[PDB]
Amino acid sequence: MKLIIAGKNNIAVDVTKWIIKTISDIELYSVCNENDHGNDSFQLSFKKFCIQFNIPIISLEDAYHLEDAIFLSLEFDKIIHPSKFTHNRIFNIHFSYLPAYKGMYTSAWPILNNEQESGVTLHKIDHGIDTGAIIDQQKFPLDIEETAKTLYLKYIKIGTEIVIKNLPALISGNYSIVEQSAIKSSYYSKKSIDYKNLMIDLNKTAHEILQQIRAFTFRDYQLPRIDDIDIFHGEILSSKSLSKPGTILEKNNYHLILSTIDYDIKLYSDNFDEILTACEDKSPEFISKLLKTENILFEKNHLGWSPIIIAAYHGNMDVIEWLVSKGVNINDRNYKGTTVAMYFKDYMLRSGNYTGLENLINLGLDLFLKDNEGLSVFDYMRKNKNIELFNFMSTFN
Amino acid sequence: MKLIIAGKNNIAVDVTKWIIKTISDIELYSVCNENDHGNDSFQLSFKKFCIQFNIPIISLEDAYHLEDAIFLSLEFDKIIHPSKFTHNRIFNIHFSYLPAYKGMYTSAWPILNNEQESGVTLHKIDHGIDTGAIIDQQKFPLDIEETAKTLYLKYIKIGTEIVIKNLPALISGNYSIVEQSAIKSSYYSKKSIDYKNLMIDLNKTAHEILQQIRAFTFRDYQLPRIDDIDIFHGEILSSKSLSKPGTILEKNNYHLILSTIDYDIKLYSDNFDEILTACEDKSPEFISKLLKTENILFEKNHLGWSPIIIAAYHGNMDVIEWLVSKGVNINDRNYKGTTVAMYFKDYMLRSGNYTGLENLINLGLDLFLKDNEGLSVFDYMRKNKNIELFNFMSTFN
Ligand SMILES: Cc1cn([C@H]2C[C@H](O)[C@@H](COP(=O)(O)OP(=O)(O)O[C@H]3O[C@H](C)[C@H](O)[C@H](N)[C@H]3O)O2)c(=O)[nH]c1=O
Ligand SMILES: Cc1cn([C@H]2C[C@H](O)[C@@H](COP(=O)(O)OP(=O)(O)O[C@H]3O[C@H](C)[C@H](O)[C@H](N)[C@H]3O)O2)c(=O)[nH]c1=O
Ligand SMILES: Cc1cn([C@H]2C[C@H](O)[C@@H](COP(=O)(O)OP(=O)(O)O[C@H]3O[C@H](C)[C@H](O)[C@H](N)[C@H]3O)O2)c(=O)[nH]c1=O
Ligand SMILES: Cc1cn([C@H]2C[C@H](O)[C@@H](COP(=O)(O)OP(=O)(O)O[C@H]3O[C@H](C)[C@H](O)[C@H](N)[C@H]3O)O2)c(=O)[nH]c1=O
Ligand SMILES: Nc1nc(=O)c2c([nH]1)NC[C@@H](CNc1ccc(C(=O)N[C@@H](CCC(=O)O)C(=O)O)cc1)N2C=O
Ligand SMILES: Nc1nc(=O)c2c([nH]1)NC[C@@H](CNc1ccc(C(=O)N[C@@H](CCC(=O)O)C(=O)O)cc1)N2C=O
Ligand SMILES: [Cl-]
Ligand SMILES: [Cl-]
Ligand SMILES: [K+]
Ligand SMILES: [K+]
Ligand code: NA
Ligand code: NA
Ligand code: NA
Ligand code: NA
Ligand code: NA
Ligand code: NA
């Protein structure tokens, strides 16, 4: 068989990796999205990956003429018409529990509409928008403080899994379909949200305002901004101003308080930059007071730097352990795949203090992971001839 | 006690009637809505009613200065501020299951949002929009072909009941409250729907388009109009045009067929006028073919004339019985309260054929009802000196 993987991001990358590890005899090809210019971001560039792993990249046009192929769209950006192929072995992963939420912005809309869950759906491509028969789908609940970013990461992940579970069946042809019901079918278009002129409607209830805030929270693209302040989460108060919804009751460095249709809301200014800086050398105590929401402890900057990555690079041992106690991953990575252990090794090197490593190993620090270049911490130390640190790190299980 | 009834429509009228029948010693006052100019429509004018029943009509301003009073808002149109009263005995009926759907157009929005149910809520007035503590509420399911009109009539009815059930408790002061949750609180404003420039979004799924159609179906105000055709219901087909959503696939006297995001839809032109005319003298068979949806058999024109009222006035006996077999009320009334029996008596008079009456009585025709003027069929025949018909009608139980 030939297998054509058209799309982008960690879903296209991780499915392709699994195929490589698991299916030989398959002849792989890649079609990439138009805005994929080779740059890794909060997601990997699938184009860069394919070039490095020698997966031939072809045009959508070339894809039409391949016979004895399977075509699989993973967040692909161009319309695929099944009449342009000799076969009907054409599949898509859609980021919703179809028939609901066909179309665009499916990381926002379920939140805006205050859904209790969402899902991912594997289905056949037909001529229209997310309309072809369903092969498989899985659902999952939305968290109370779900954001568009957290939702999107759940899609990437569940999408990847649902594809890998179904791949053998698509390749063999031994899978079932069910036509999508008309009932409960919904669709949003490109025009349904203007991200370049985002307005929060403040003539709304506290809950509705917060749902809009959280729907529009996706740091790599934007934070919601109100009265010139970037907002990162908030809360519903018990007070109820008599003033008109939208009235600013309080504005300072820390927060905005607004009158709504029902209960006043408190909206936290974003202090993520201040948090990262604090993680360099302040105590867990200092950080717990600086933060307004514990969600900020799992945020990452444009490089993929999280609080734990800062604490590790600066050898701030108390903050590392505290963050872990709040459910932060001790083996967190930046966007190049560089791990906590890699950062903490740098601190060991620069400082000459090796005494903290044991603690971290005990907390589950993994020395054997590899970055996106396929190198471990050991490959780095060998390469840079840091042999005494290599050997000290090598004693640990 | 004094009891001030502020509002409009059959809810304000029927609550006031119950008070009159059931509570003496209460001193009643009325405050009316600004657009209530004394005219009965698909709802009674509360102003006309109060004038005829000698309920003194006062200004909202006068209402503030009444001591030892209770104030009850039933679809009232001006904002009520509890700080303007000596007491806090101030209640409202809202047409939703609060905390959801505060604000406007609550006969549309639950339909647009494809809710499975709605309700009515009795609560205290506080300073804001539909935000005060809840005294009582009842919920009910939305029908699959619910329209804004059918929904609205359910509100009028359930509202009326919930008020009558609770009145003694409000008068005594022996009732409980519960503060409205923030969670699941929603609000729509005046601006959320422009009824003077209504657009149906056709770049949507079949189901979404039909939900918008039905949400905007309220004959006294408007029918949805697409491509210059008034629409009265429709259906989802099994075909799926490849053409773009909104493409008109077929247009004739009977219907529009449109391409959507998923399944084609068939939208019925309104033929209500043609149906009423048919009921004058055509068969049940003829009418069953003329209609495109059985919903059209329960529609009424600006006078309150329904199909059964036409068949009765014209003595079309087969159509009367058939309509009854489809669940039409044999004691239907127009908007002046004039009943089927009143219309059928006219036919008896004009034609001299008395032979059908027995059948109708057997089907449950009620000769003892009174119109809005408080007259029965017998009061009319006495008045007009139609004594042989009076006496023939009088033999029936
Ligand atoms: C463009 C943009 C997106 N978002 C959020 C909401 C989106 O659901 C999420 C993903 O962005 P996105 O550009 O991938 O667009 P989406 O609209 O999510 O996905 C569509 O486009 C993809 C290329 C696929 O064809 C997919 N099948 C489509 O549904 O990020 C922002 O918060 N701000 C933004 O400015
Ligand atoms: C996290 C952090 C990093 N840095 C430095 C370290 C890097 O030299 C530079 C870019 O960071 P980065 O996350 O993009 O680094 P990467 O290129 O992913 O990883 C390199 O740097 C690590 C420290 C390890 O040595 C690893 N073996 C290297 O491949 O910024 C800071 O100065 N302050 C910081 O707080
Ligand atoms: C004005 C209008 C209303 N409608 C429908 C939807 C509405 O829910 C329903 C009732 O009309 P409406 O003018 O009573 O306005 P609503 O918006 O339903 O009710 C508000 O105004 C009332 C006076 C009360 O203050 C009530 N508490 C408010 O919620 O009729 C139309 O279909 N076309 C229309 O043009
Ligand atoms: C239903 C119907 C009524 N009419 C006439 C009868 C009335 O004279 C006029 C207005 O109708 P309407 O529903 O407003 O009448 P109403 O004023 O409600 O009722 C009067 O007319 C009835 C027939 C009874 O005599 C009753 N006792 C009267 O009070 O239209 C028709 O010509 N064709 C019809 O199909
Ligand atoms: N047949 C098919 N259906 C899909 O839903 C789909 C594919 N193919 N392929 C990948 C991706 C592409 N999705 C899209 C969706 C809409 C437009 C589009 O042109 N959208 C405009 C209308 C026209 C315009 O932009 O000029 C819009 O308003 O949304 C382009 C690509 N997609 C599934 O993910
Ligand atoms: N305190 C109180 N709350 C209510 O929700 C309420 C009452 N009173 N009294 C009766 C009725 C009146 N409702 C309303 C609601 C809004 C406006 C209003 O002015 N609305 C505009 C904003 C201002 C404007 O029109 O200039 C809007 O955008 O909706 C007037 C009367 N109503 C419950 O039924
Ligand atoms: Cl090194
Ligand atoms: Cl008479
Ligand atoms: K307020
Ligand atoms: K279509
Ligand atoms: Na299947
Ligand atoms: Na947009
Ligand atoms: Na060295
Ligand atoms: Na109560
Ligand atoms: Na409006
Ligand atoms: Na006479």
Write a concise synopsis of the structure shown:
It is classed as transferase. The structure is a homodimer of 397-residue chains. The first copy, chain A, is α/β, with parallel strands linked by helices and 397 residues long.
Assign the structural class of chain A, choosing from mainly alpha, mainly beta, alpha/beta, alpha+beta, or little secondary structure.
alpha/beta
Give a list of the ligands: ligand T3F, ligand FON, chloride ion, potassium ion, sodium ion
Q: Quick one: overall form of chain A? A: flat
Biggest beta-sheet profile of chain A: 6 strands, mixed
Helix tally of chain A equals: 14
Strand content of chain A: 15-25%
Give the quaternary arrangement of the chains.
homodimer
How are strands sequenced across the largest beta sheet of chain A?
A: 2-1-3-4-6-7
When the domains of chain A are counted, the total is: 3
Q: What is the strand tally of chain A?
A: 13
Order of helices and strands of chain A: EHEHHEEEHEEHEHEEEEEHHHHHHHH
Tell me the helix content of chain A. Answer: 25-40%
Rounded to an integer in angstroms, the radius of gyration calculated over CA atoms of chain A is 24 Å
Largest interface: A-B, 29 and 29 residues
The end-to-end distance of chain A, rounded to whole angstroms, is 42 Å
PDB class: transferase
Keywords: formyltransferase, ankyrin repeat, lipopolysaccharide, deoxy sugar, transferase
Assembly: dimeric
Entry title: X-ray structure of the N-formyltransferase QdtF from Providencia alcalifaciens
